[PDB]
Amino acid sequence: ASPLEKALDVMVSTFHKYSGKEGDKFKLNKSELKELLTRELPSWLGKRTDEAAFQKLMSNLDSNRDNEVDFQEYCVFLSSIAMMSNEFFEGFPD
Amino acid sequence: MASPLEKALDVMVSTFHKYSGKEGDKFKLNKSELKELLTRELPSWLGKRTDEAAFQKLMSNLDSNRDNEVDFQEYCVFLSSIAMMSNEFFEGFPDKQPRK
Amino acid sequence: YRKLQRELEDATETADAMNREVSSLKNKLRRGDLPFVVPRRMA
Ligand SMILES: [Ca+2]
Ligand SMILES: [Ca+2]
Ligand SMILES: [Ca+2]
Ligand SMILES: [Ca+2]
């Protein structure tokens, strides 16, 4: 398996590390998403704790309006982060 | 420090550029670059058609803004779709299915 | 962590459009419309 293939599998495994803790086994509620972000994506936490901003993130990601973040919605979240990392990668040549 | 997921996101970015920067627009994948990325980095995901017509159809459907390139966002739409296939495999198993 | 607030919120303001794009592509793959790629994970 290539690094990219392994990376896609990490996306899947990490989701399920949290999604099965509460309620729907295959979706992230707000608490589960918060844990995932805090523990697995701490490099993306805001400078200050900010519950309002976190609520807005949850709302933004819940595209199908079911009060949960499913796997597809989570892939869109990760893509959005990757797109920012990509802007940094491309945007600052020496 | 970096989590496996943080590292995985960096691999998404680095892999894209390994190929996008070979020719022409250094920040988008042309047909040749996409084909190399797929064949070399996603070989487990290649289907039963390998001909150029089938590849062109894929290119056309990834290239949603019809500029004859696959940009980073278009590439993420594709990777998300692949990850979803893996997730559907994962979720088919019983909850306490053994793993390492 | 970041030096600012709200960057994740900013980056996800158009999540709906991206979900609709992913849904479209996933459906094409699943239905076998793009047989250069598999429709399901396979060994
Ligand atoms: Ca859950
Ligand atoms: Ca949802
Ligand atoms: Ca290029
Ligand atoms: Ca394009």
Residue numbers in the entry:
A (entry chain A): 2 to 95
B (entry chain B): 1 to 100
C (entry chain Q): 1893 to 1935
The authors write:
It has been widely recognized that the conformational change upon Ca2+-binding opens up a hydrophobic cleft on the protein surface.
In two crystal structures of Ca2+-bound peptide-free S100A4 the hydrophobic cleft of each subunit is occupied by the hydrophobic stem of the C-terminus of an adjacent dimer, which may explain the formation of S100A4 oligomers that were observed extracellularly. Since the ITC measurements did not reveal the true affinity of MPT to S100A4, we also performed fluorescence polarization measurements. These showed that WT and Δ13 S100A4 have similar affinity to fluorescein labelled MPT with subnanomolar Kd of 0.12±0.06 nM (SEM) and 0.28±0.11 nM (SEM), respectively.
